[PDB]
């Protein structure tokens, strides 16, 4: 039997905060061997830790479990098996981390300096580029036809010289065109 | 006439939202665009949970917010043109429940000598396999007939002893997808 190693699933994509495991399966002799996992940085992973878990199942398999995934867990992980005579073989598995459209920081209420230049904060995270739309009472602010309203490149909404009749509920809406994903956060703007 | 829906098919996670754009190869032509739910109901423009929004002469958008299992099914976009003839497109909407725990009370207390039932309610669109652990070790390794995993995944410990106290893990896995989730439950005797 020519020493061989495989990982199942052969690849994976874990959503932020969720968990997945990968089995390193060996096909070699019928003896004892060493199966070691290495993280993307090329460093060996210690077994039995609670979040980035490496558990020994039997002589021919070790399981890697990435619990409560975060974007920094992304990368090519490697499993290397060393038979008793020193012979080695390895397999790699590319792990991607996916961040669905979410609002990292969209405070409410958001109070403002009357007559001052307001900037409504809306920090969005998403692996896929989102298209942002700001609404007031469910209507795209761009339709107000007011030069004072400008959507900034960081998705924040600027309202120059804000007035009281500008107060109300502003929704920061994110969509992923052609894929159908949408999420929003309603923000109470107070003047 | 031609009718198209994008995304062509969609899977919405329970509690999340997804939108579907119905587009007609529009032109200088009058025509009506309407959305119908899986049960055949005509969905009218609204800004409610099952939203329908008129975009322009050639398109209307259906948005399903805070999706629940009863929203599953084939939705239909029909385009009736000038006389009363029609064309359609359909989109199959799946509601996806990821491997999660509806209930996993902690701690859970039982009286020594009593038959204890440790509560763990797991939900998942895809049927998972359950493993119960005590101190991080699979309970079957005890080879103790007092430990029985019930049909609903609850862990029963007959005549629970003080020595059975500790951290139990109700772990669910979906091998086919390499998915896993768990909840630790403190058992007090």
Explain this structure:
2 copies of one chain form a homodimer. Chain A has strands spanning 4-8, 11-15, 20-27, 34-38, 52-58, 61-66, 75-82, 88-98, 102-105, 110-111, 118-120, 123-125, 131-136, 139-140, 149-151, 157-159, 168-176, 181-190. The first copy, chain A, is an all-beta fold. Chain A has 2 domains: 3-98, Immunoglobulins (Immunoglobulin-like, Sandwich), CATH 2.60.40; 99-191, Immunoglobulin-like (Sandwich). In chain A, strands 10-18-17-13-14 form a 5-stranded mixed sheet, with no helix packed on it. In chain A, a hairpin with a 2-residue loop joins strand 13 (131-136) and strand 14 (139-140). The N and C termini of chain A lie far apart (76 Å). The relative contact order of chain A is 0.17. The interface between A and B is medium-sized, with 19 and 17 residues. Chain A: One of its GO terms (cellular component) is external side of plasma membrane. Chain A: Keywords: Cell adhesion, Cell membrane, Disulfide bond, Glycoprotein, Heparin-binding, Immunoglobulin domain, Membrane, Phosphoprotein, Repeat, Signal, Transmembrane, Transmembrane helix. Chain A: It is found in: Cell membrane. Chain A: This is Neural cell adhesion molecule 1.
């Amino acid at each position: 039997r020519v020493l061989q190693v495989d990982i199942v699933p052969s690849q994976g994509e874990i959503s932020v905060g969720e968990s997945k495991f990968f089995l390193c399966q060996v096909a070699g002799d019928a003896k004892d061997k060493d199966i070691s996992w290495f993280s993307p940085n090329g460093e060996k992973l210690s077994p039995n830790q609670q979040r980035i878990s490496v558990v020994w199942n039997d002589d021919d398999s070790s399981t890697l479990t990435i619990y409560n995934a975060n974007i920094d867990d992304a990368g090519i992980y490697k499993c290397v098996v060393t038979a008793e005579d020193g012979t080695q073989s390895e397999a790699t598995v590319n792990v991607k981390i996916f961040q669905k459209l979410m609002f990292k920081n969209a405070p409410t209420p958001q109070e403002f300096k009357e007559g001052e230049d307001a900037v409504i904060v809306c920090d969005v995270v998403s692996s896929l580029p989102p298209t942002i739309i700001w609404k007031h009472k469910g209507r795209d602010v761009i339709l107000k036809k007011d030069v004072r309203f400008i959507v900034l490149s960081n998705n924040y909404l600027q309202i120059r010289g804000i007035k009281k009749t500008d107060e109300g509920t502003y929704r920061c809406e994110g969509r992923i065109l052609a894929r159908g994903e949408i999420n929003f956060k309603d923000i109470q703007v107070i003047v």
